[PDB]
């Protein structure tokens, strides 16, 4: 429980990161390994996520707006970089 100071750019970053998180929950559920309590955490995160994307998009110009599926792709790349600790996964996540 130790907080790390961040800047404004972390909001849109977290929305994308957690989009990728959702995409993993979903792929995991395909394996039929996601228990019932776990399936609820999947559905609620999607609910909030869609609520936050809809809220964030309006707060930003149209040319920069992104869909749930568009952010998933960015979040996936980001997660690959963190798991493999290698920008090659990768580059799209910016590093």
């Amino acid at each position: 429980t130790t907080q790390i100071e961040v800047g404004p750019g972390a909001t849109n970053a977290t929305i994308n990161f957690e989009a990728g998180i959702l995409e993993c929950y979903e792929r995991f559920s395909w394996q039929r390994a996601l228990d019932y309590p776990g399936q609820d955490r999947l559905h609620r995160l999607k609910r909030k996520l869609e609520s936050r994307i809809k809220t964030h998009n309006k707060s930003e110009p149209e040319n920069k707006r992104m869909s749930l599926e568009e952010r998933k792709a960015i979040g996936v790349k980001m997660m690959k970089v963190l798991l493999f600790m290698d920008p090659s996964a990768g580059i799209e996540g910016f590093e």
Binding site: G9, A10, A13, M85, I91, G93, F94, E95
Partner: protein, 151 residues
């Protein structure tokens, strides 16, 4: 100037002088954003190939106006070390590399019953600095840090 790029797009600039060196780049980054050196994983952009601490930045595929990628390896996996008091008695301490030398001294103070400003720690000959994280000294499980008494 050199451009440092982090995960999620955040950027900042670094000035390298007089000559280019990886060791210095990391020290520079530490001063700019406060990321400990030992946690820095640097890579060339857009290559994605990790820099090498030995070889200078100009002797690599890197130079002026070029971008580097920073990923931060937390390196905060708990581990145990040994600290030998003035009488030769060694005790174990649970620590993380991301905690400060000062925090380890607080742990040593309480256990050893000695004020912290009345001693300093040393590892492999060299002294440990209050403000630095334990990870800068490359401590390992059951490494032996020595206690030294002031006057």
């Amino acid at each position: 100037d050199l451009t440092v790029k982090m995960l999620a797009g955040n950027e900042f600039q670094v000035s390298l002088s007089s000559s280019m060196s990886v060791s210095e780049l990391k020290a520079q980054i530490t001063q700019k954003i406060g990321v400990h050196a030992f946690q820095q994983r640097l890579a060339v952009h857009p290559s994605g190939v990790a820099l090498q601490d030995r070889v200078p930045l100009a002797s690599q595929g890197l130079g002026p106006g070029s971008t580097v990628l920073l990923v931060v390896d937390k390196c905060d996996e708990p581990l145990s070390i040994l600290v030998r008091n003035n009488k030769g008695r060694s005790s174990t301490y649970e620590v993380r590399l991301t905690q400060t030398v000062a925090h380890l001294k607080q742990q040593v103070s309480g256990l050893e019953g000695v004020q912290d400003d009345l001693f300093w720690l040393t590892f492999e000959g060299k002294p440990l600095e209050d403000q630095l994280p334990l990870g800068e000294y490359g401590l390992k499980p059951l490494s032996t840090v020595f206690m030294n008494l002031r006057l």
